[PDB]
């Protein structure tokens, strides 16, 4: 089966809003959730990192900002771990530069299952959401599925591969979304 | 002709807040709302949760962490300069006896007459899960009309989540 990142309603909206407010700059933040079995990453929530960085490096991550935010979120019942990071590339589309690879490396050190999410919030206004999620591949480094090998090779080519993305919503959120509409 | 424009994310965040804190039957949750109030329509674009405690058996005792509003707003200012502190929300379902008093304390953080959003989190009714209030002498709550305005990025988000 295919590993899949499940993104909750507020996570998607906060991402979209933050990416849009940062145009023309690449903006960035952290994603909170949980890892489950091997085919499942839940993104429950997200928060923005300040644009202190010139661009989107490991340096753009504000350790004291992150800790202060995690601490205050905890006091209001948000207690999930960091499951990766997201960043926007405005108009550039969904993929990773070499700098993003490096940023992602440093996230994988902390946690082997860490995910990188790219949003293009400009292209998203065409009436469809342009997001994807990515991981590095270098661990794995006669029936088969042809499109899975085609991908596993382009993967080795650029040093990373994509994950499926889905959206979760509670029945309550569903009801509420139907009124915000 | 006072009107409120509410972004969907704000309501979704009230909801998520109320659910994650396991908010018991009769209890309520409380937060801060952020947006723009320099014009005749009030733009509510964001929110964040507060630690908050009341006494179910005594409605005149309640605790709001002032440090926390200060420290959080400070951090919101670092990501978006334009989103100011304009009011507060709670989960209701109706106006509570201590609300005027709570409202008075939020005045010290806002630059308007603070807006009170009562968010219906129980969804047991027909349309907009939100009623907007402002305090006024005429001290008593005035119902204001409100509506949903979504900056395009959010709007196709909301429609992508429903398809």
């Amino acid at each position, epitope marked *: 089966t295919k590993e899949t990142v499940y993104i909750s309603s507020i996570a998607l909206l906060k991402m979209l809003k933050h990416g849009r407010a940062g145009v023309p700059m690449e903006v960035m933040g952290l994603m909170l959730g*949980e890892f489950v079995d091997d085919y499942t990453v839940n993104v429950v929530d997200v928060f923005a990192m300040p644009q202190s960085g010139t661009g989107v490096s490991v340096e753009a991550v504000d350790d004291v900002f992150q800790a202060k935010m995690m601490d205050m979120l905890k006091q209001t019942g948000r207690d999930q771990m960091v499951v990766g990071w997201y960043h926007s590339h405005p108009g550039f589309g969904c993929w990773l530069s070499s700098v993003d690879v490096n940023t992602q490396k440093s996230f994988e050190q902390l946690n082997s299952r860490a995910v990188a999410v790219v949003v293009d919030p400009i292209q998203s206004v065409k009436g469809k959401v342009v997001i994807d999620a990515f991981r590095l591949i270098d661990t794995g480094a006669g029936l088969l599925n042809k499109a899975n090998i085609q991908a596993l090779i382009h993967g080795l080519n650029r040093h990373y591969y994509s994950l499926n993305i889905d959206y979760h919503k509670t*029945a309550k959120e569903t009801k509420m979304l139907m009124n915000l509409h | 002709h006072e009107k409120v424009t509410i972004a969907p994310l704000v309501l979704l965040s009230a909801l998520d807040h109320y659910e994650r804190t396991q908010t018991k039957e009769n209890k309520r949750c409380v937060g801060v709302i952020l947006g723009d109030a320099n014009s005749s329509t009030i733009r509510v674009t964001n929110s964040f949760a507060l630690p908050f405690e009341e006494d179910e058996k005594n409605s005149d005792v309640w605790f709001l962490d002032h440090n926390y509003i200060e420290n959080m707003n400070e951090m919101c200012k670092k990501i978006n300069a334009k989103e100011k502190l304009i009011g507060w929300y709670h989960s209701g379902p109706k106006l509570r006896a201590s609300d005027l008093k709570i409202n008075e304390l939020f005045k010290k953080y806002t630059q308007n007459n603070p807006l009170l959003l009562i968010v219906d989190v129980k969804q047991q009714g027909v349309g907009l899960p939100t009623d907007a209030y402002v305090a006024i002498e005429q001290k008593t709550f005035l119902h204001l009309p409100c509506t949903i305005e979504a900056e395009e990025a959010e709007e196709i988000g909301v429609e992508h989540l429903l398809r």
Partner: nanobody, 121 residues
Framework: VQLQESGGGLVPAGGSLRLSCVDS????????MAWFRQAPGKEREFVAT????????YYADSVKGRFTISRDNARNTVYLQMNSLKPEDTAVYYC???????????????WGRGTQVTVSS
């Protein structure tokens, strides 16, 4: 109420129980069933989760190697088989359903009323 738990009761330490939950499927559609448990004066705690289609399963650490969750999806039933029971497994057990495959109680959509398991000390 759509979910109805069953099984459960008093068992000695070391003993075995099989909990079941039947879903009537009349208000909530679900792709995921979970068991949760709540001991008095503790938080609700995640036990195990399963996908209706596929049967993928996930377990809480304190429960691995001894509990098994499974589902008879033509019969709309979920099972929690509990072996090697310890007194700290005493709690009310709730099945829940929704679309979130994971651990967080507030991400589930509907709840049974719970069934008491008492493991003798």
């Amino acid at each position: 109420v759509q979910l109805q738990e069953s099984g459960g009761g008093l068992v000695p330490a070391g003993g075995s129980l099989r909990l079941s939950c039947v879903d009537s499927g009349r208000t909530f559609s679900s792709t995921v069933m979970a068991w949760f448990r709540q001991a008095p004066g503790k938080e609700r705690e995640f036990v195990a989760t399963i996908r209706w289609s596929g049967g993928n399963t996930y377990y809480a650490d304190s429960v691995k190697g001894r509990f098994t969750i499974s589902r008879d999806n033509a019969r709309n039933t979920v099972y929690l088989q509990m072996n090697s029971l310890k007194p700290e497994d005493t709690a009310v057990y709730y099945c829940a359903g929704g679309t979130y495959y994971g651990t967080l109680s507030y991400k589930y959509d509907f709840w049974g009323r719970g069934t008491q398991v008492t493991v003798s000390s």
